Design brief:
monomer; 173 residues; alpha/beta; Rossmann fold; five-stranded parallel β-sheet; 7 helices; 13% strand; binds lithium ion; ribosome biogenesis; Adenyl_kinase_AK6; EC 2.7.4.3; adenylate kinase activity; Adenylate kinase isoenzyme 6
């Protein structure tokens, strides 16, 4: 068996994390994990709301749920948050970025209401996730990836697959 790396795909909802992670998993063999889906599957919530009519994700339980698998390596994690993940989990972190105009159209198409649209659009224009990533991990392993069109998705997949290949070689001497 090969020692495999762990990758974090983060960024504002709508930037294309899920589409990228799923394609990466299919073309690399690594396991893709959507944190939101995982919390829903294992019911890792604590608290509700009237605000957005959605249960509140239990960060500590999410970490406990994934730790053993992360320790073993070979996981692509997808989430619009990253400050609560143990720093040791990831070998590289990609913050997907989408032009505000493009992101708005995507989220609107997803059926986001005015409130959710504004909250997420400001999250992106304020570069919240990029800042969160740089504050949570060493800047040398944090990279912003443009994600506005199929062409950039393709460039991202290609660059990450090549990164994975080099990493596996360097860490399985
Ligand atoms: Li937390
Ligand atoms: Li650094
Ligand atoms: Li950049």
């Amino acid at each position: 068996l090969m020692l495999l790396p762990n990758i974090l795909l983060t960024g504002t909802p709508g930037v294309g994390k899920t589409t990228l992670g799923k394609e990466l998993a299919s073309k690399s063999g690594l396991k893709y994990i959507n944190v939101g889906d995982l919390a829903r599957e294992e019911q890792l919530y604590d608290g509700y709301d009237e605000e957005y009519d959605c249960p509140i994700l239990d960060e500590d339980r999410v970490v406990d749920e994934l730790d053993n698998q992360m320790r073993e390596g070979g996981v692509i994690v997808d989430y619009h948050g990253c400050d609560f993940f143990p720093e040791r989990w990831f070998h590289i972190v990609f913050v997907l970025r989408t032009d505000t105009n493009v992101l708005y159209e995507r989220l609107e198409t997803r059926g986001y209401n005015e409130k959710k649209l504004t909250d997420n659009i400001q999250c992106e224009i304020f570069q919240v996730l990029y800042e969160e990533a740089t504050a949570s991990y060493k800047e040398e392993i944090v990279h912003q990836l443009p994600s506005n069109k199929p062409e950039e998705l393709e460039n991202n997949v290609d660059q990450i697959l090549k990164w994975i290949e080099q990493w596996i070689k360097d860490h399985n001497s």
